[PDB]
């Protein structure tokens, strides 16, 4: 619901070219705040958000140790899954792991999730109850059994219900101005003649946070099926996001066309028109 | 699933040795702890995977290495009395989950091998005042002058080992509380009905397993070699 | 220490409930364990706990409270075999050093002696040695046995044996000396 702490882990095997590549990133809501990358002499976990620049070495030392422990086990697991599926030792393969916790409006735990993927496809999922697993196949069933025997669910639930929630609180406090004080879209319409008798109206939403947004074109305030191209929401590179929506319109009929923007950072949905 | 050797061991101040630890489970994490008598376990060294090592709380005196996933030898560089202790090896799936310990190693560091002595054993027969007044008979076994404190006492009745009616002291006594190389005493009790005791075909044996010196240790003295050995004593029942 | 347990020892009457407690100093701890150790043997795991609240397994209940930084163990219907050292261990995720153990709490389950008859007997050697031990027996579980005040006289601790088929428990301590001065009659004072 209200807020989340998620991590995304990628390990890629390179047999013959040393140990697997391992990258780990952490997000609060839509804001990345830490990263660990083992392509380096001594890879450390490092900050990726200015509100994380004021943590002491106790943070970085632990997170670095914890990151390296993760890389290690992901190496081991990459080996195991290669066996399970009897693949050649020459092949490069990808094990991914996402997990997160969400707060409800009361600031308390609402839900938790966790999911492994091998070569870009679900492998093993922690169920909603956080007490058991779903395996996609015979190999993943071997993994289910081993995690049952090891009480892995119980350990994951402690992380997700408790530790994860408690640090999310800390992070939301340290990045309050960015995470709670949202950034609404700066919003404008541009105009691009296609021919003699038609033009593209392009509705821009720029500089918005979080990433979730809706841009709609309407015709005399009603839903039309003209040509309406919508680009995928993209990062601005500074922590905010961008999107545009476009319609082709009969030249001279531009002002029958309104763009509607919805975003969590706006007091109210906004409406926008070409300004010649 | 964790094989640790040796079970017992005596060392002279200044010797080195290696304690073995093997795991079958192929876990990444292995550890060494030690425990002094009546105390907690304290972590010596550990290893998060093949070819990595770190120091625990009490690294001093010891080295470790992790060539393979499977084995994690501990190495006493130069033996000292303060390293007299019980040493436990462990394996772990994760850094912070359950530790699965080995059977342990009891290690006594002694200033000279001519302090080591096997125990004398004696069986003491029930009091007739006890038989009269209670209709029960308590035999006492008593093991004397052993060192180091590495013994296991058992009771055998008619050649089969017994546990019912039996009771061994928790720890032994120092014969010479003053001396730092004091030899030890240890007592036990077997209690049986008067009736059972008074059948003289009934055979009572107190067996005391001792752990001393190995073949390849060196003995340079009059007395025989305080080698690993059983020392027994026996009584038969008695009509009166 | 980082992990605090009282060393005790603690008594519990047989059949009664035992409670053991453990505190730890570092809020960053995330795993908690109760191990049991029978004297000079390897710790055997009783219970693991990671979520706040209660966890039950047979006669054993563990309570974890991370806000107050304690774990406890409760033993229902205490038995002789529950006599042991109970070791508390935490996983401190801030420091990373595998599992950290407390100093251990030693628990003695004490059975009720049905018909106490404190007596001292004297035992002759099975070989002609003329040697003898003194046996203090059949006292109650609240009687403690004082340590030797004489450097030439040896007195053991008390231990309890169980004549299973007789449904009968006796306490016992042994005493002996080299001096011929030595009378059993007043050995155990």
């Amino acid at each position: 619901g209200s807020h989340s702490l998620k991590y995304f882990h990628t390990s890629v095997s390179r047999p013959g070219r040393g140990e697997p590549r391992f990258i780990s990133v952490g997000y609060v809501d839509d804001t990345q705040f830490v990263r660990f990358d083992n392509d380096a002499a001594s890879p450390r976990m490092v900050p990726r958000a200015p509100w994380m620049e004021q943590e002491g070495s106790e943070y970085w030392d632990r997170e670095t140790r914890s990151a390296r422990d993760t890389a290690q086990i992901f190496r081991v697991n990459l080996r195991t899954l290669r066996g399970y599926y009897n693949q050649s030792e020459a092949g490069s393969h990808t094990l991914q792991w996402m997990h997160g916790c969400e707060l409800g409006p009361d600031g308390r735990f609402l839900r938790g999730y966790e999911q492994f993927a091998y070569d870009g496809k679900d492998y093993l999922t922690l169920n909603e109850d956080l007490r058991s697993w779903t395996a996609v196949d015979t190999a993943a069933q071997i993994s289910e059994q081993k995690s049952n025997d090891a009480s892995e669910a119980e350990h994951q639930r402690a992380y997700l219900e408790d530790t994860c929630v408690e640090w999310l609180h800390k992070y939301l406090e340290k990045g309050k101005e960015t995470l709670l004080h949202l950034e609404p879209p700066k919003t404008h319409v541009t105009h691009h003649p296609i021919s003699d008798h038609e033009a593209t109206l392009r509705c821009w939403a720029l500089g918005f946070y979080p990433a979730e947004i809706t841009l709609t074109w309407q015709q005399d305030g009603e839903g039309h099926t003209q040509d309406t191209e919508l680009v995928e929401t993209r990062p601005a590179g500074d922590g905010t996001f961008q999107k545009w929506a476009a319609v082709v319109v009969p030249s001279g009929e531009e002002q029958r066309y309104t763009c509607h923007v919805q975003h969590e950072g706006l007091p109210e949905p906004v409406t926008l028109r070409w300004k010649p | 699933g964790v094989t640790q050797t040796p079970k017992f061991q005596v060392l002279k101040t200044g010797q080195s040795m290696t304690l073995q630890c093997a795991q079958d489970m192929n876990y990444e994490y292995m550890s060494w702890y030690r425990q002094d008598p009546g105390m907690g376990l304290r972590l010596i060294h550990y290893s998060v995977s093949a070819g990595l090592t770190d120091q625990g709380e009490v690294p001093n005196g010891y080295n470790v290495s992790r060539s393979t996933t499977e084995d994690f030898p501990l190495r006493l560089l130069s033996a000292a009395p303060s390293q007299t202790s019980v040493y436990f090896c462990a394996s772990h799936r994760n850094r912070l989950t359950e530790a699965f310990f080995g059977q342990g190693t009891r290690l006594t560091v002694v200033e000279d091998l001519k302090n080591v002595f096997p125990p004398e054993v004696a069986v003491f027969e029930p009091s007739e005042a006890e038989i009269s007044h209670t209709q029960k008979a308590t035999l006492v076994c008593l093991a004397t002058g052993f060192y180091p404190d590495h013994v296991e006492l058992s009771w055998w009745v008619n050649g089969k080992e017994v546990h019912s009616g039996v009771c061994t002291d928790p720890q032994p006594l120092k014969e010479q509380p003053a001396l730092n190389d004091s030899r030890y005493a240890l007592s036990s009790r077997l209690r049986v009905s008067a009736t059972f005791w008074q059948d003289p075909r009934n055979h009572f044996r107190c067996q005391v397993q001792f752990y001393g010196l190995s073949e390849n240790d060196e003995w340079t003295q009059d007395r025989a070699k305080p080698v690993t050995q059983i020392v027994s004593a026996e009584a038969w029942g008695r009509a009166d | 220490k980082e992990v605090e347990q009282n060393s005790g020892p603690l008594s519990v009457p047989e059949g009664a409930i035992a409670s053991l407690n453990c505190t730890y100093s570092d809020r960053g701890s995330v795993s908690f364990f109760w191990y049991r150790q029978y004297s000079g043997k390897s710790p055997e795991l009783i219970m693991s706990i990671y979520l706040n609240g209660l966890k039950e397994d047979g006669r054993f209940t563990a309570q974890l409270n991370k806000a107050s930084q304690y774990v406890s163990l409760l033993i229902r219907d205490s038995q002789p075999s529950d006599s042991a050292t109970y070791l508390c261990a935490v996983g401190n995720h801030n420091t990373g050093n595998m599992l950290t153990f407390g100093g251990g709490t030693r628990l003695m389950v004490k059975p009720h002696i049905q018909n106490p008859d404190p007596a001292v007997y004297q035992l002759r050697d099975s070989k002609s040695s003329d040697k003898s031990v003194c046996l203090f027996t059949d006292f109650d579980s609240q009687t403690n046995v004082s340590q030797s005040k004489d450097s030439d006289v040896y007195i053991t601790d008390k231990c309890v044996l169980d004549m299973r088929s007789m449904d009968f428990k006796s306490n016992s301590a042994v005493a002996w000396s080299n001096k011929s001065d030595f009378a059993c009659a007043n050995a155990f004072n």
Partner: peptide, 9 residues
């Protein structure tokens, strides 16, 4: 913070 608890597949 990263998850301390790492499944072995």
């Amino acid at each position: 913070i990263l998850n301390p608890f790492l499944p072995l597949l």
